[PDB]
Amino acid sequence: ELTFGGFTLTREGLLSSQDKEVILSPTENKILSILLMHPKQVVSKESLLEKLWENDSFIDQNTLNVNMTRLRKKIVPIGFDYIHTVRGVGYLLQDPN
Amino acid sequence: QELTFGGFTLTREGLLSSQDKEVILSPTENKILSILLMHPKQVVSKESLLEKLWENDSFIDQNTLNVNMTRLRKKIVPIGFDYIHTVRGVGYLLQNDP
């Protein structure tokens, strides 16, 4: 499993912490997985798309945009507010502490 | 992907796809179907399915299993995966497959 800040992501797409859970689609799962594998690193949109293709998610950039938005809307409510937008660059997974 | 049966493939992330159609399974639905896919053409009792779920990080009870099994079948039967058979009082059976 992938872990970050007390959250665990399972291969089937369960993200959980404490008594909180959300279920991620395969695309949402693969996006979050890539970020969890690169904590505290700025991941450009191009790099994220490349890594998705590496993992058999052959989506385009608008699909990536939509799924990133859906992902964040899903996981912020259970306390995973660690994905930051870097305007014009990409994303950064980082825990303020 | 890798588990496959009856023209369908199940990815680890929960995508069940045929040549024509696909559906996304919840983690519990994924685990249930995976257990049946790993025991094809075998009768799997409810007790056995439950313990195997409990041996793979699930925490549901029998009544929540029934709801999940109904929800699973309502997701996958419409895309042509009608291979889960109920055996009254016994359990479930995954089975040219008919």
Residue numbers in the entry:
A (entry chain A): 128 to 224
B (entry chain B): 127 to 224
Lines from the paper:
Here, we describe the crystal structures of the N-terminal RD and the C-terminal ED of the lantibiotic resistance-associated RR NsrR from S. agalactiae. NsrR is part of the nisin resistance operon. The expression of the genes of this operon is induced by a TCS consisting of the HK NsrK and the RR NsrR. NsrR belongs to the OmpR/PhoB family of RRs.
The structure of NsrR-ED from S. agalactiae was determined using experimental phases from a single-wavelength anomalous dispersion dataset from the rectangular plate-shaped crystal derivatized with platinum at a resolution of 1.6 Å in space group P21212. The asymmetric unit contains two copies of NsrR-ED related by two-fold rotational symmetry. The ED domain of NsrR consists of six β-strands and three α-helices in a β6-β7-β8-β9-α6-α7-α8-β10-β11 topology (the secondary structure elements are counted in continuation of those of the RD). The effector domain starts with a 4-stranded antiparallel β-sheet, followed by three α-helices and eventually ends in a C-terminal β-hairpin. The structure of NsrR-ED also contains such a wHTH motif built up by helices α7 and α8. In the structure of NsrR-ED, helix α8 is identified as the recognition helix, α7 as the positioning helix, and the loop region between helices α7-α8 as transactivation loop as observed in other RRs. The 16-residue long, solvent-exposed recognition helix α8 of NsrR-ED contains four positively charged residues that can potentially interact with DNA. These are Arg198, Arg200, Lys201, and Lys202. The rmsd between the three helices of the effector domain (including the two helices forming the wHTH motif) of PhoB and NsrR-ED is 1.6 Å over 47 Cα atoms, clearly indicating that NsrR belongs to the OmpR/PhoB family of RRs. As a result, a highly positive groove is created by the two ED domains of NsrR which likely represents the DNA binding site as observed in KdpE.
